[PDB]
Design a protein around this ligand. Structure first.
Ligand SMILES: Nc1nc2c(ncn2[C@@H]2O[C@H](COP(=O)(O)OP(=O)(O)OP(=O)(O)O)[C@@H](O)[C@H]2O)c(=O)[nH]1
Ligand SMILES: [Mg+2]
Ligand SMILES: [Mg+2]
Lengths: 81, 74, 506, 56, 271, 116, 86
RNA sequence: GGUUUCUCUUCAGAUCGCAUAAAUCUUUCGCCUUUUACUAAAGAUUUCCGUGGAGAGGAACAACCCCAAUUUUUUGAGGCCUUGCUUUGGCAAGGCUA
């Protein structure tokens, strides 16, 4: 698969977030992920187009619906590039 | 290739569909196809006017499908 | 006589749920330390030896990719295979959360395999099985594939019936379909399950569903070509079963090609298997060759890590069926639940089951797992004896931590802080304590309980009286008998009424 | 480089000298003598390459 | 320069068959259990002697209570085999001792009779499997008739190759050959450095050949052990080359001659 | 009562006689002998007193050229053939006592060391 | 065909412009098939990217960090910095 | 841009060289009238027969056709009205459409 997709796959379990195609953000821990980008997240926070922030228990969302996504300070460590 | 949603554990549970149009429905998500399509029965659409109106069984178009957020801990 | 990576391992530490605590067990000589050795190379490209027998067990901590790439923390307690050092199996099954019985392709069921499944049942761990040394069916045994499958099915059915002997609840029947058993030949660089075998099958070939495919192979299912559809018994093709057809036959030829047709048929079959090899690396001798080729085909380790993570409690799931046996209460008010959290937090109730002395001095390195709390350097901690009961506190000696070590097999890794979920080698609490200790908060008192001092499989029956030649150095001889009593689990010494020093052993 | 010779060269010198009695050579006398210190090298060398009975 | 050879497995199997006579028909080392260098080192150090092994001069040269004859039970009498198997349990002051032990997983590699029957071929020698049990088992068996189907691109990962050839049974036999043969490529040694008979004198039970030859066996064993024991790393180096220093001088010529000729030459020169 | 050991000896075909003889030498009680399927090996199983458990490994491997191999575990205690209390049974103090007197000696020597 | 034109600006700093118009400043440590961008220590800039303006260069700034974006919207790639040897 | 080979220089075996010789010294052991030549153990040091690492020249020999409706080379995300906002800019909101 792709190198960013592999970073995401190994990011299963670690603390991350995402910003979807519409401009809202959802943060969470790594629960599920696919090479097809179908994102399973849990105990997340949600911050909407004005900034409405809250908790969401679990969800699974299509890949194309994600534009950006935040990883923690760990993974940057396949440094062959 | 052709990997579908990991929707076995997610089957048979009520989730709210947020898709295009600001499109909000609720409904029991019990199945789909590997294109990320849904087939969600008991769907009550939550229009902008706030009304949740039940229409029943449909084929939950993954095409513009953004996300589904469930009401149980599955 | 790891700068950018120990941070990473530490965050995995604080994860406490990518981590796997197992004891690596089995019978004698059966491949364990060889797999571990090849594996330390997979990790770093960076008396026992001459005896050829493993005597004491060793802890290893490593970070391994599973078949999707998520790194895992692995605590592996590699045991002795010798019947008499089973006290090491006891300590290992204590401080770890599951067991991996590794069994030989050539033998199957014997003494330590049998009584090791027995010990693991009576202490309710996870049950893993890795059948190893599979060349011993092919090059050594010369067994055609059908009867090869026969023997494999036999080892499986014997061990399973025996676990049925020791287990009331048939919650688990083991066969490679579920994630129970890896297949390996440790020195020849091979680990696989039907899972990863078929998954690399796919990763090389067409798109087919690797997981559903893995669901189809072991256990008497056939496949007919024209249908391309797996069937219960209905080829009168009078052919093999899916597992044979897909794994044995091909690898039988793989080997027979490596060792028989090393010269001509290996270039073409090497192309056909996708691996290229340079002239100088085919200019190798047969066993180094077969090892390198098997690596470059079968990939690293995946049957093992996959099956293991697939059937692991992981102390965060962990604690709960354990505190029953571990703790003297299990769960009443304070500390059963305290550890039951398995969080890095507060209480700090610990179980040190090993003490490895420095070749230099008299001190030890205590070794045990963090059920509760978070231990760090200089932290005062108060130890809980084997005789320590709630209202016998003199037994509790109170100390601190000098330095903190973590173990890859024979390299020592010092840091300053560790949370619940791990094992650890403590410096500083050796002199007060005996075979087992249970550690608690220093100068912080809420209230503490202890675990029952470790119970064994074996009957100690042998009697050996010992004396110095000149009675003058008897206190030094006493220092020595101390140190052996502390470094050994059930070696029991007594100063007998006749005035003597007797040892009772296995 | 230092290069080989026809065998007949040495053969001629050696059958020439024979046993150093002829007053012709009369100085290889003393060099011959001084060569004794290495006669145990010649013998080890000769005997460790012997012809291994399947070759003639 | 004639080094570093590489060979073909046909070559190797033919050679093996030809040097079959001067060879050991052993497959592993569980034969030499109490008969190896380390056992001999322990014996030598304890001045004990294995039945068929060498004897060495003793290494170095009142009352006790454990030896009290009223307190002992002799049910099976101690012997030197035990005192060497467990050096520290069965001996006081065991000094300069090697603790040798071996539980080598016995190897079972079955000789064929003819080349004919296939490489993999169940021979009577193996015991007939006949694994028995209860009602054997059932599985979480994913029945078909729901569905599954193989996109007919894949194959059983290689079926276009036969399992065996006219090289397979060789390639298996050559997997347990003494060190010279169990290879395919390696350096060449000097002609002297090859001891042919080591495998012969290192055998454990000669079983009734004259006392002459049995004593011979043991004294060759002794020489072997001493050589092993007194071995130094070469420890130092300076690197004269006598013959190059000779050849680089204006008095030395060179040739290629016949052995016998240089032989009569050397003799004449010495005389 | 003295303990017994269960032993599990893998053996090639021939030395069955050997293990039988050795166990008889040490009061064996071979219970079981059965092949290993998929190999020309046998596995023999037997009891043997903790007393005569000593060096039996070396004895066996020596007599059979290491072909056989013995592993042992304590299995159970049992009655020793002796009458612990008879004064008319005397100890020839180094020769091996025959079965009627194993517990008699056992007591005498054990107390002689310890019990007085 | 020479195919380095990616990796040459890889291992180098890059300003990535998504179809959302903002400036994502990050190291191009790699690309992907769909052109996704996994770049660390990243900064999200919304008002401008600043170019030696006597007025200022810091307006509408946030720290994103290790960001992994899907290349579905990866629009423009420029070089904003050289390699920091870290 | 590589091997084979010649020669020239330079450093090392910590289990070797899957083989294994001799010498010197210190001390015990034995042969015994004296010394050499010996025995056979230990310890400490060496020579020799081979090998390995590095470099320099030099030589011979190889060679300047189909394609997109959840992640990018087709994608209908379209407009405006009004409001609130904020200094204008501009932001966010509801609706009408066709
Ligand atoms: N022939 C063969 N042997 C193998 C293979 N993999 C492992 N082994 C065996 O593994 C041994 C290495 O030592 P181990 O047997 O693992 O030591 P151990 O069994 O762990 O000893 P304990 O620690 O006391 O249990 C080698 O002697 C091999 O006999 C293999 O693929 N082929
Ligand atoms: Mg081991
Ligand atoms: Mg005189």
């Amino acid at each position: 698969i792709g190198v960013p997709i592999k970073v995401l796959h190994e990011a299963e379990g670690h603390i991350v977030t995402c910003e979807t195609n519409t401009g809202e953000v959802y943060r969470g821990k790594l629960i599920e992920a696919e090479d097809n980008m179908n994102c399973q997240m849990s105990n997340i926070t949600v911050t909407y187009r004005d900034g409405r922030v809250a908790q969401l228990e679990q969800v699974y969302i299509r890949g194309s619906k994600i534009r950006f996504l935040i990883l923690p300070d760990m993974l940057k460590n396949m440094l062959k590039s | 290739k052709a990997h579908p949603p990991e929707l076995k554990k997610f089957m048979d549970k009520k989730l709210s569909l947020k898709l295009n149009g600001g499109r909000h429905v609720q409904g029991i998500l019990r199945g789909f196809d590997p294109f990320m399509n849904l087939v969600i029965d008991e769907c009550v659409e939550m229009a902008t006017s706030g009304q949740q109106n039940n229409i029943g069984m449909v084929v939950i178009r993954g095409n513009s499908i953004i996300m589904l957020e469930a009401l149980e801990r599955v | 006589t790891t700068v950018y990576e120990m941070d990473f391992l530490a965050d995995l530490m604080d994860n406490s749920e990518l981590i796997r605590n197992v004891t690596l067990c089995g019978h004698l000589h059966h491949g364990k330390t060889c797999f571990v050795d090849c594996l330390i190379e997979q990790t770093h490209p960076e008396t026992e030896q001459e005896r050829g027998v493993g005597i004491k067990s060793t802890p290893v901590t490593v970070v391994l990719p599973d078949t999707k790439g998520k790194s895992y923390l692995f605590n592996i307690m590699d045991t002795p295979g010798h019947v008499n050092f089973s006290d090491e199996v006891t300590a290992g099954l204590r401080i770890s959360d599951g067991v991996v019985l590794f069994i030989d392709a050539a033998e199957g069921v014997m003494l330590n395999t049998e009584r090791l499944i027995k010990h693991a049942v009576q202490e309710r761990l996870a049950v893993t099985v890795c059948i190893n040394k599979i060349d011993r069916l092919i090059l050594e045994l010369k067994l055609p594939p059908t009867d090869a499958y026969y023997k494999l099915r036999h080892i499986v059915d014997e061990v399973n019936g025996l676990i049925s002997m020791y287990s009331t609840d048939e919650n688990l029947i083991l066969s490679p379909l579920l994630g129970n058993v890896c297949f390996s030949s440790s020195q020849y660089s091979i680990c696989f399950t039907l899972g990863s075998f078929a998954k690399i099958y796919a990763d090389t070939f067409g798109d087919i569903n690797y997981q559903e495919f893995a669901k189809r192979l072991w256990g008497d299912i056939y496949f007919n070509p024209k249908t391309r559809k797996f069937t219960k018994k209905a080829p009168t093709s009078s052919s093999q079963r899916s597992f044979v057809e897909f794994i044995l036959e091909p690898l039988y030829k793989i080997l027979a090609q490596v060792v028989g047709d090393v010269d001509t048929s290996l270039p073409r079959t090497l192309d056909e298997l996708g691996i290229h090899l340079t002239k100088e690396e085919l200019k190798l001798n047969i066993r180094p060759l077969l090892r390198l080729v098997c690596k470059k085909f079968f990939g690293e380790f995946t049957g093992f890590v996959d099956m293991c993570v697939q059937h692991i409690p992981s102390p965060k799931v962990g604690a709960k069926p354990k505190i029953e046996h571990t703790y003297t209460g299990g769960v009443d008010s304070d500390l059963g639940e305290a550890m039951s959290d398995c969080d890095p937090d507060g209480p700090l109730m610990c179980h040190t089951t090993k003490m490895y002395s420095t070749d230099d001095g008299v001190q030890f390195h205590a070794f045990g797992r963090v059920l509760s709390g978070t231990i760090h350097a200089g932290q005062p901690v108060k130890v809980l004896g084997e005789n320590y009961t709630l209202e016998d506190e003199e037994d509790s000696q109170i100390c601190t931590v000098g330095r903190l070590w973590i173990s890859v097999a024979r390299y020592h890794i010092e840091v300053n802080r560790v949370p619940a979920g791990n094992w650890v080698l403590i410096e500083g609490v050796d002199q007060p304590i005996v075979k087992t200790a249970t550690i608690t908060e220093p100068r912080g008192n809420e209230e503490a309980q202890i675990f029952r001092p470790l119970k064994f499989n074996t009957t100690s029956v042998i009697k050996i009286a010992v004396e110095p030649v000149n009675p003058s150095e008897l206190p030094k001889m006493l220092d020595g008998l101390r140190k052996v009593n502390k470094s050994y689990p059930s070696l029991t010494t007594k100063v007998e009424e006749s005035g003597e020093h007797v040892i009772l052993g296995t | 480089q230092k290069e080989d010779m026809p065998p007949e060269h040495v053969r001629k010198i050696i059958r020439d000298h024979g046993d150093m009695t002829n007053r012709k050579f009369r100085h290889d006398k003393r060099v011959y003598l001084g060569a004794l210190k290495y006669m145990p090298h010649a013998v080890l060398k000769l005997l460790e390459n012997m012809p291994m009975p399947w070759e003639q | 320069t004639y080094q570093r050879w590489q060979f073909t497995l046909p070559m190797m199997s033919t050679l093996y068959r030809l040097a079959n006579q001067l060879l050991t028909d052993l497959v592993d080392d569980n034969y030499f259990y109490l008969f190896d260098l380390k056992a001999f080192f322990t014996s030598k150090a304890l001045n004990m002697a294995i039945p068929g092994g060498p004897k060495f001069e003793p290494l170095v040269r009142d009352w006790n209570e454990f030896n009290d004859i009223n307190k002992i039970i002799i049910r099976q009498p101690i012997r030197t085999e035990y005192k060497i198997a467990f050096p520290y349990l069965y001996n006081n002051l065991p000094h300069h001792v090697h603790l040798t032990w071996y539980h080598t997983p016995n190897v079972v590699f079955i000789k064929t009779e003819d080349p004919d029957l296939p490489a993999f071929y169940f021979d009577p020698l193996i015991n007939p499997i006949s694994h028995r049990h209860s009602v054997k088992s059932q599985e979480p068996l994913p029945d078909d008739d729901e569905e599954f189907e193989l996109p007919e691109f894949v194959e059983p990962f290689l079926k276009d190759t036969p399992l065996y050839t006219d090289n397979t049974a060789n390639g298996i036999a050559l997997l347990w050959a003494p060190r010279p043969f169990n290879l395919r490529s390696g350096r060449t040694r000097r002609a002297l450095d090859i001891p042919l008979v080591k495998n012969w004198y290192r055998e454990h039970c000669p079983a009734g050949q004259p006392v002459k030859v049995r004593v011979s066996y043991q004294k060759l064993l002794k020489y072997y052990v001493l050589n092993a024991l007194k071995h130094r790393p070469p420890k130092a180096q300076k690197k004269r080359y006598l013959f190059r220093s000779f050849k680089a001088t204006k008095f030395f010529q060179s040739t290629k001659l016949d052995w016998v000729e240089v032989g009569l030459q050397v003799c004449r020169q010495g005389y | 009562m003295e303990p017994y050991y269960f032993v599990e000896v893998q053996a090639p075909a021939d030395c069955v006689s050997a293990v039988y003889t050795v166990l008889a030498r040490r009061r064996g009680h071979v219970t079981q002998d059965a092949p290993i399927p998929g190999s020309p090996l046998y596995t023999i199983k037997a009891f043997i007193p903790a007393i005569d458990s000593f060096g039996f490994e070396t004895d066996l491997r020596t007599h059979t050229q290491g072909q056989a191999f013995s592993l042992s575990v304590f299995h159970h205690w049992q009655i020793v053939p002796g009458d612990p209390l008879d004064k008319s049974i005397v100890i020839r103090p180094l020769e091996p006592q025959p079965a009627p007197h194993l517990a008699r000696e056992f007591m005498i020597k054990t107390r002689r060391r310890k019990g007085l | 065909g020479k195919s380095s034109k990616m990796l040459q600006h890889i291992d180098y700093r890059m300003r990535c412009i998504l179809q959302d118009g903002r400036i994502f400043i990050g190291t191009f440590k790699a690309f992907d098939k769909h052109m996704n961008l996994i770049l660390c220590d990243c900064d999200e800039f919304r008002k401008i990217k600043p170019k030696n303006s006597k007025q200022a260069e810091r307006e509408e700034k946030r720290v994103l960090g290790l960001v992994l974006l899907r290349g579905e919207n990866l629009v423009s790639m420029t070089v904003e910095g050289p390699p920091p040897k870290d």
